Amino acid sequence: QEGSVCLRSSDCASGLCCARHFWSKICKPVLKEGQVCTKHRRKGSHGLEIFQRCYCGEGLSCRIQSRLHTCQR
């Protein structure tokens, strides 16, 4: 459920992933088309991330449009 406390991604329902929000993890929605997605400049920015986004959707891919990155296909 969107907002539920999770530890594994499989705790979350369809269309959702388990993402770190602050000092806990909650079920966030998976990124659909055009929505901005995280591109980590250095490895460990991933680790440091306290406001993590989900991955992209079923048939989608996270690539570039100092610019930013969106879920394309």
Binding site: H21, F22, Q35, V36, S45, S66, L68
Partner: protein
Amino acid sequence: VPEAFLLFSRRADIRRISLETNNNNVAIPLTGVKEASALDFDVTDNRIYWTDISLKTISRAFMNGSALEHVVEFGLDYPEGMAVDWLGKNLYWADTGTNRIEVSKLDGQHRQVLVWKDLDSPRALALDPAEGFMYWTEWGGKPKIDRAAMDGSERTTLVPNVGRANGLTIDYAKRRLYWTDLDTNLIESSNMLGLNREVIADDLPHPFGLTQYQDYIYWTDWSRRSIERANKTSGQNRTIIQGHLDYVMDILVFHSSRQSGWNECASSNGHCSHLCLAVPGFVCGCPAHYSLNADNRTCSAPTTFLLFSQKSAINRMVIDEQPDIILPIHSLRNVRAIDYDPLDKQLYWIDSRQNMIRKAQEDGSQGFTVVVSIQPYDLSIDIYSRYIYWTCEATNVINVTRLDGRSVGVVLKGEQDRPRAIVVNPEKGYMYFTNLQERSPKIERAALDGTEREVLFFSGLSKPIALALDSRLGKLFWADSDLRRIESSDLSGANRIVLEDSNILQPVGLTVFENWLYWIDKQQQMIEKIDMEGRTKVQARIAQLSDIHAVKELNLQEYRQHPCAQDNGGCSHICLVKGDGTTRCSCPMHLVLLQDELSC
């Protein structure tokens, strides 16, 4: 001319440091803070204002730590941003969870919702009341920087093509906006209008918070574990103020030089009765759902509204031409059903697991327990006789008790009878109820004293769970959960009509407002209504809605015209306005009526 310093939050505590190149790092003596995020201050008051996301609250306290008090305890989720308006003496906050930018007085009173529609994720928030504008970062799917007048009006999107922005700080003197970008790892600036947009520092590891003071910008970096300074114009003169700091959430420079200027709200609240909000000078605000009077200065409390509960919340909502708010009622677990008394403005509900019936004001300051353990199911209030009728799931009974708590008795019992939903009709002297018998459910009708029993329907029923009635038109309404539909009939029993059978999923609750039948749909997660204009959605994505109750304006003179309204019509137990237009006394099932015709 006092000292200037920086304040920052680090989840566990809020710390205070000077601008000096490597000085001391103390903590503000606060108590019971778990996950601090959003910061702000008040110089005149010398008060600090913070947001806890573990506690789900916005609190305040003096810098010495004394007078710690919760300013906002209800209706929050993730309040990630929040600013203090020093001229109006109002608190502004942005909840990224509820997706709402809100406002109240600094003390917490007269809370109002400024923007809530077509809003994604309001994170950071900066106020400029001297000019009447507020600014906030939006995160979500397509991040941006929006600006609106500090009352809610004139909402526009200033900076459209940015990542997640976080340090939102107005250089009040030079009229520029500085922010961090988390997805580009850079710090950027603009003019007040969003144009003239050039980056200041772009090779940053992992920045987060930011504040500008004089000719310097200050930011936090998690990878660098640092608080850094740089020239707010060039991005040069880049030295470290603090190192070896793990996770520095937000940060703002504390000096009277920031909370300066003037608007009309600073001179005796601008003569508003509640809120004074700045605009590009001022305008008087009301609490959520209150309405501005003809004078443009005073407010009036809602008269006709809608009440709906979830499992652990009771929400209020208005039927205006122009959002739902959470009523502050502590100790809610599994709210099964609600009801309302318009005379004393008291809100009655039945909690499950706890097996009690409770009452409290819309402000929650009257919290009193009516019935205690045996488990109730549904409740209906005879507002005239001042009795509450209820059903017992455990003992299959229709018990009746007074509003004070004093027991009146039982009106209907017997084995094989299994009464669940109930709705009372004191104006005509009858009660209509749902009797969920094994393998054969029914909708039934009896007089308010349990006499004159009859079955209204027995077919095309499976799980009737909610009842409502329009006494003026003389109709009865019920929702079957199993058959996913809403039906209505004459109170007599005639004219059974299907209203909706098409896009219903889990109807469990309904009430008549004016010429509309509102209904809850637990599974489909939405409130809908139908013109008894066509079916209209009212409120989607509602959590675990459980009961709904439309409350209309109760005029006193009109109420008193009822015969039982004054001193229960002489009756010691049950007043019945039957037939022509006269009262007649009656008693519960364990007492027989006496000689005086009034007592038993």
